[PDB]
Design a protein around this nucleic acid. Structure first.
Ligand code: NI
Ligand code: NI
Ligand code: NI
Ligand code: NI
Ligand code: NI
Ligand code: NI
Ligand code: NI
Ligand code: NI
Lengths: 118, 118, 118, 118
DNA sequence: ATATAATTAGGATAGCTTTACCTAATTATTTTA
DNA sequence: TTAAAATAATTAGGTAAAGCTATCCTAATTATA
C-alpha cells in the first residue's frame, strides 16, 4: 500500500530527478510496481489538480505546487528514517519501508520538532 | 481521513465497550463523523470479512480476531501518544490526532521496539 | 459478454422506455448485472460520444443519434429471433441469448434481406 | 474489429497451414492487418493460455486445444457463409465479411442445427 | 550484405472491480408515558 | 394501556479514487537466416 498515492508519485518524480533520470510514467510504474494504465490514470488526476504537467515529450513537469509537497514528503521521509534509525533504534533494514508509510502521516508540527530533537 | 477504516471501526467498538456504551452502529457513526448508511455498510463488510458480528440486540460483537486487532491498534495508539509527547515533545493538545493517524501506520517491530525504548 | 456494451446500453435504455419505466443508470446495472461505477463510467463515455445525455433527474435521455442505433439494435434483435426461431429452428428457450449476440454483428445489408425473406 | 481476437488468430494459423505457408507471427500480422508487436504480444497470451506453442523455427504450433478451437470457428465460418448465401440470400461478395463476424457469435446449438437445416 | 522477422520502449482505450462515503426517504425498533 | 415521540436502520441511487487485463499502436534497435 502506498498509504497515499499522489504523494508517492510526487516523491518518486522528485527522486527520479535527483538521479538525473527523466521522469516518465514508465519509471513511476517500474518503481512503484504498478500497471502502466494505472499510472497514466493517476498522473491524469494529478495533472487535473494541478500537481504535475505532462510535457510534450511525455516527461512529467511538476508544478510549483506539486514540487512543494514533493519536497515535504521527501523531508518528512528523511526525518522518519532518522527518528526510526537513531532514537527508536529499529533495524536499519526496516527503516525505509517504515518511513515509507510515516511520510504520509507526519505533520508539519511533528516535522518542525523532529528536526529540533534530531 | 481515517487512514484505515476497518482499524478505526474496531478501535471505536473497543472504546465504546471500555466505557460501558452499547456498541451500536448509531454510535460509531457519531463517533467517527460518518453517515448511518455508510456505517451500516462498512460494518456489513467487516462482518463478511469475519471481524465483527452484529448480534440480535443489534450490537456489534468483535469476533476473536476482531478483538485482536482492536487491541493492537489501541496498543500502538497509546504507544504513539507517548512517543510523541515524551520524546518528540509535540504539543499535548495535538498528540491524540497525530496518534490517531500513526496507529495505523506503525509496525509491530516498531511497536515491540517502542515498548522498551519508550 | 455483451459483445458490444454501448449497444446493449442503448438497446436497454430503449426497452426500459417501452416498459414505461424511467431509465436510470441504476436500471442498467440491474438488467445488465454490472457494477454501479461501471455503468456511470460507460454512460460517461456514451455521453461523450453523444449517444445519450444525463438529465437533471439522473434520467438517461438518448440523443437522436443514440435513439437510432438504439432502434437498429432492437430491430436486428427481433429479426435474429425470428431467423433463429423460424427457419433455423433453434430451441425457443435459447433464441434470445443467441439473438442477444447476433444483434451486434448483423449488418443493415443482412437486416434488409432478412425482413424480405422472413 | 475482430469481434474475438484469439479465435481469429487461431483461424488464421489454421488457414496458413491449409495453404502450406509457415505460420509465423509476421504472417498473422499481414493477414489480420495488425502491427508486429501487437501480434507478438497477443500470441504470447495464447501461449500462456496454452492455445498455441511457438516452436523453435519461430513457427506457431496449435496445441490440441488450440486446434480444436481453430476447427470450430472454421466450421462456424463455413456454415455462416452458406446460411447467408443459400437462405439469407445475401450478396455473395459480402458473405465472407459477414461470416467473418458471425463465427465468433454463433453457438454450437445453432452450429449443429444449421448442419442439418442448411 | 540484405532482407526479413522480432524486440524494446513507452503509450492509449475500453471495460470492469472493490473500497469507502454521501443525501433523501422510509421502516423498524423501542419504549415508553 | 397502548399508540406517538424519538431512536436506530434501511432503501435508493450515486460518487470518486485505486487498480487491473485485453488489445492495439508508432519508433528505433536486433536478431536470424
Ligand atoms: Ni529512504
Ligand atoms: Ni510512502
Ligand atoms: Ni488517545
Ligand atoms: Ni486512527
Ligand atoms: Ni428478445
Ligand atoms: Ni446483445
Ligand atoms: Ni470464407
Ligand atoms: Ni472473424
Amino acid at each position: 500500500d502506498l498509504v497515499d498515492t499522489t504523494e508517492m508519485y510526487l516523491r518518486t518524480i522528485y527522486e527520479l530527478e535527483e538521479e538525473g533520470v527523466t521522469p516518465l510514467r514508465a519509471r513511476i510504474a517500474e518503481r512503484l510496481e504498478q500497471s502502466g494504465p494505472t499510472v497514466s490514470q493517476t498522473v491524469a488526476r494529478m495533472e487535473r489538480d494541478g500537481l504535475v504537467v505532462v510535457a510534450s515529450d511525455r516527461s512529467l513537469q511538476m508544478t510549483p505546487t506539486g514540487r512543494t509537497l514533493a519536497t515535504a514528503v521527501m523531508r518528512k521521509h528523511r526525518l522518519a528514517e532518522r527518528l526510526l534509525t537513531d532514537i527508536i533504534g529499529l533495524d536499519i533494514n526496516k527503516v525505509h519501508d517504515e518511513a515509507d508509510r510515516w511520510e504520509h502521516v507526519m505533520s508539519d508540527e511533528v516535522e518542525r520538532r523532529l528536526v529540533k530533537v534530531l
